[PDB]
Design a protein around this ligand. Structure first.
Ligand SMILES: Nc1nc2c(ncn2[C@@H]2O[C@H](COP(=O)(O)OP(=O)(O)NP(=O)(O)O)[C@@H](O)[C@H]2O)c(=O)[nH]1
Ligand SMILES: [Mg+2]
Length: 178
């Protein structure tokens, strides 16, 4: 058996919460966007000698669930607050929406700030798409700054598609607890 660890995942509609978990636990990725209502995944992981039943709770980013979402929060060992490195709108909500909601229900429980979609921050298609609307993809130093600002215990960037940065997200989610 292994040590139970409840990891809860929050952030804007479409940032890649779900994809990030599917990609970690099954190495699978979909182009398709099927919005989460609520889901639950598991992963027996081996980190630094010790073994762990990582529980992972995938929450709906959509505001409709603002009322129902914090039912997930009691007894959480660590949170992942997720933002797309490619939607600065999803970025500001980290201190606007996601850090207040979490600390409101769980004021002590560690946070790991997660910049998702790392594979698109260098994409011409996507840099150009934003250029139009006065926009900048979120850089590492800016992400790091946001993390410091919310007392995130780590800042970590990833892509569920390439899987660049992927395993370190969960390795560190487990590390915020042990
Ligand atoms: N290029 C790229 N696209 C990604 C990545 N992760 C997710 N996406 C895409 O982003 C969209 C949203 O993914 P999804 O995981 O469903 O987001 P979510 O935040 O879980 N959704 P919700 O909050 O509504 O449940 C999909 O088109 C998905 O394929 C990534 O690492 N790279
Ligand atoms: Mg989801």
């Amino acid at each position: 058996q292994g040590q139970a660890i409840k990891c809860v995942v929050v952030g804007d509609g479409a940032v890649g919460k779900t994809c990030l978990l599917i990609s970690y636990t099954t190495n699978a990725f979909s182009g398709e966007y099927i919005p989460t209502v609520f889901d639950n995944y598991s992963a027996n992981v081996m980190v630094d000698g010790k073994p762990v039943n990582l529980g992972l709770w995938d929450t709906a980013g959509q505001e409709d669930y603002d009322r129902l979402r914090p039912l997930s929060y009691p007894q959480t060992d660590v949170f992942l607050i997720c933002f797309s490195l490619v939607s600065p709108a999803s970025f500001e909500n980290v201190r606007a929406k996601w850090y207040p909601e979490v600390r409101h229900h769980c004021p002590n429980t560690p946070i790991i700030l997660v910049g998702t979609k790392l594979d698109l921050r260098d994409d011409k298609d996507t840099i150009e798409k934003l250029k139009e609307k006065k926009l900048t993809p979120i850089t590492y130093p800016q992400g790091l700054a946001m993390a410091k600002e919310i007392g995130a215990v780590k800042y970590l960037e990833c892509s569920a598609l390439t899987q660049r940065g992927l395993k370190t997200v969960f390795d560190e989610a487990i590390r915020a607890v042990l």
